[PDB]
């Protein structure tokens, strides 16, 4: 009765909802069986990587619930998440606290 | 004469024509080296259209970097370039037009 | 009637932090982030099977879609955590 | 310390920036443009050898560069 393919994969993001969306979008004519288990991993690893940084955003700002500001200090203070989301402006966001050079007393 | 004219007659000669400006065999020996630092150990094999495909992009991107980077020289009252004028022109394009 | 990924993301947050909550508008960003990576990967993987004269998005043509739609250091850890989730699904 | 990157020769970078309208080049752009050119060729040949190693060949063709510059953001109209 071990029939949940997500629990078979040892993942947490769903499998069957990815397999449903790979046909209603018309991305190919036939969709492989081993494919949407591999897409339910990379979206987990791109979800566990942000929230591990956003988890250290709330702890170092002394709050316990991640607000949308905390993602903005989580994504931009990475190197590689900048170059991933180069076209993304997060709403209710903010900018980085940039102390300029020639403002130093 | 001490100097007849060097820079003005050479520039309007070069914008008039449509050459390539980097000699091909060094540009092949640059590309094959960068290709082997990826895909470890095993080399590859390049058609003679692909090396004329980068050279119609690399000498189409560096020439469009310099004309854009030269407008930061005129904004400071200089004439000459500097690496203050290229390291600023790779910034303002913002991470998807030369990194 | 419209379905989200919200219950699934909330399980990931508890797996890496035992107590960290999440506000409602923050769950909204975690949706339209994870559809944007999804529409890029499963949109660019369509272009390869349309290029290479095939018809099936396989488990391989997501892997060369991962190595393009991500930058450098985040690639090699994603793909090595990628194929591990396929091998144990095969020999279950 | 002999060769293999100084093939982008000393007056060749000069004759590039003549086309952009540079009257007079300083004495570090000869090293600076060789820096930009190496970080331009690692964000093309990574995307270009990826399409070649995917569809299992050993030859990077003309279509293997026009695609990888189209996904980059620089569509080229020479060869595709």
């Amino acid at each position: 009765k071990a029939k949940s393919r997500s629990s078979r994969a040892g993942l947490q993001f769903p499998v069957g909802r990815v397999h449903r969306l790979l046909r209603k979008g018309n991305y190919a004519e036939r969709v492989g069986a081993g494919a949407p288990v591999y897409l339910a991993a990379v979206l987990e690893y791109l979800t566990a990587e942000i929230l591990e940084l956003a988890g250290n955003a709330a702890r170092d700002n002394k709050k316990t619930r991640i607000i949308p500001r905390h993602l903005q200090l989580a994504i931009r203070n990475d190197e590689e998440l900048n170059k991933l989301l180069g076209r993304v402006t997060i709403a209710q966001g903010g900018v980085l606290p940039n102390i300029q050079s020639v403002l130093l007393p | 004469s001490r100097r007849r004219q060097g820079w003005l007659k050479e520039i309007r000669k070069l914008q008039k024509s449509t050459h390539l400006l980097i000699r091909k065999l060094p540009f092949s020996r640059l590309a094959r080296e960068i290709c082997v630092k990826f895909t470890r150990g095993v080399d590859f094999n390049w058609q003679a259209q692909a090396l004329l495909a980068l050279q119609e992009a690399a000498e189409a991107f560096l020439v469009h970097l310099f004309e854009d980077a030269y407008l930061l020289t005129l904004h400071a009252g200089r004439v000459t370039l500097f690496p203050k004028d290229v390291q600023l022109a790779r910034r303002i394009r913002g991470l998807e037009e030369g990194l | 009637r419209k379905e989200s990924y919200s219950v699934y993301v909330y399980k990931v947050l508890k797996q890496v932090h035992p107590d960290t909550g999440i506000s409602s508008k923050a769950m909204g960003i975690m949706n339209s982030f994870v559809n944007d990576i999804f529409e890029r990967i499963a949109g660019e993987a369509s272009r390869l099977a349309h290029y290479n004269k095939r018809s099936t998005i396989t488990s391989r043509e997501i892997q060369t879609a991962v190595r393009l739609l991500l930058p450098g250091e985040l690639a090699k850890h994603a793909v090595s955590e990628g194929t591990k989730a396929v091998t144990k699904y095969t020999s279950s | 310390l002999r060769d293999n990157i100084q093939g982008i020769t000393k007056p060749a970078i000069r004759r590039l920036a003549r086309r952009g309208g540079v009257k007079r080049i300083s004495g570090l752009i000869y090293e600076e443009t060789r820096g930009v050119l190496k970080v331009f060729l690692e964000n093309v040949i990574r995307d270009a050898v990826t399409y070649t190693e995917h569809a299992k060949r050993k030859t990077v063709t003309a279509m293997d560069v026009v695609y990888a510059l189209k996904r980059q953001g620089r569509t080229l109209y020479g060869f595709g």
Binding site: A48, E49, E52, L53, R76, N77, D78, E79, E80, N82 | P83, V86, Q87, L88, R90, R91, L99 | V16, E73, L74, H77, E81 | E32, G35, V36, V39
Partner: peptide, 19 residues
């Protein structure tokens, strides 16, 4: 979960020599 090395933006408009 494992760990990658995640660097603060590591100023990139200035060109880097190997040194």
């Amino acid at each position: 979960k494992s760990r990658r090395i995640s660097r603060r933006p590591s100023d990139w408009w200035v060109v880097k020599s190997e040194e």
